[PDB]
């Protein structure tokens, strides 16, 4: 019983577009990032469901340019196979990877690093 | 002039082609990899110049499918700025990253891991 956020409802409800789309499936999680993006300073805001006072399941992470532009996202698979912080942190390191590839400078919301 | 190798002259002298080309510049080093490649088992063979009995400079690393197919390569920049094992290991972790992205299963020549 709960849920936690870095992002605004807006930030999440919003829909977005990749010029150079890149999907992937990391076990129970779908990573996406626009490869067209370069030399920008990015951040990963994310929002986990919180159960009995602990970061449980990640609901949604997305990547933001300084300009509030969405450039990447990790969203649970529709079949919602139960996923672990591993599947996550893994998936994360990855998206970062893919992003860093374009000289992009990627930070992470305090929320996240916490985990674990 | 002394020097060490995993690859055959053939393997190195050879020229190759990327369906989905991906370049990058990692300080003094140019990484390349064909993003088109997927679900294959890859290995990184590399060849360092050896000075007074230590792995000094990397001359060339390339990535190989099981089928002896070249799919990625790290080659020093033409201007040959003196590079360090860092610039390297960095660059390496990267290429691996980029490769792993396509479900590719990437190994590394014993030579390499050695370093450092």
Residue numbers in the entry:
A (entry chain E), B (entry chain B): 87 to 202
Give the exact sentences the study uses for this entry.
During infection the influenza A virus NS1 protein participates in multiple protein-RNA and protein-protein interactions to perform a plethora of functions. The N-terminal 73 amino-acid residues of NS1 form a symmetrical homodimeric RNA-binding domain (RBD), which is connected to the central effector domain (ED; residues 86-204) via an inter-domain linker. Our bioinformatic analyses indicate that the N-terminal RBD forms a very stable homodimer, while the predominant and ubiquitous helix-helix contacts between C-terminal EDs bear many similarities with weak transient interfaces.
Although the helix-helix dimer interface is shared by all structures of the NS1 ED, and may have some biological role in that RNA-binding activity of NS1 is affected by its disruption, we noted that in all helix-helix structures the arrangement of the two ED monomers differs markedly relative to one another. However, at this same concentration we routinely observe complete dimerization of the PR8 and Alb/76 NS1 EDs. A key aspect of our functional model is the instability and flexibility of the NS1 ED helix-helix dimer, which seems weak and transient in vitro, but may be slightly more stable in the context of the full-length protein, or become more permanent in the presence of certain binding partners.
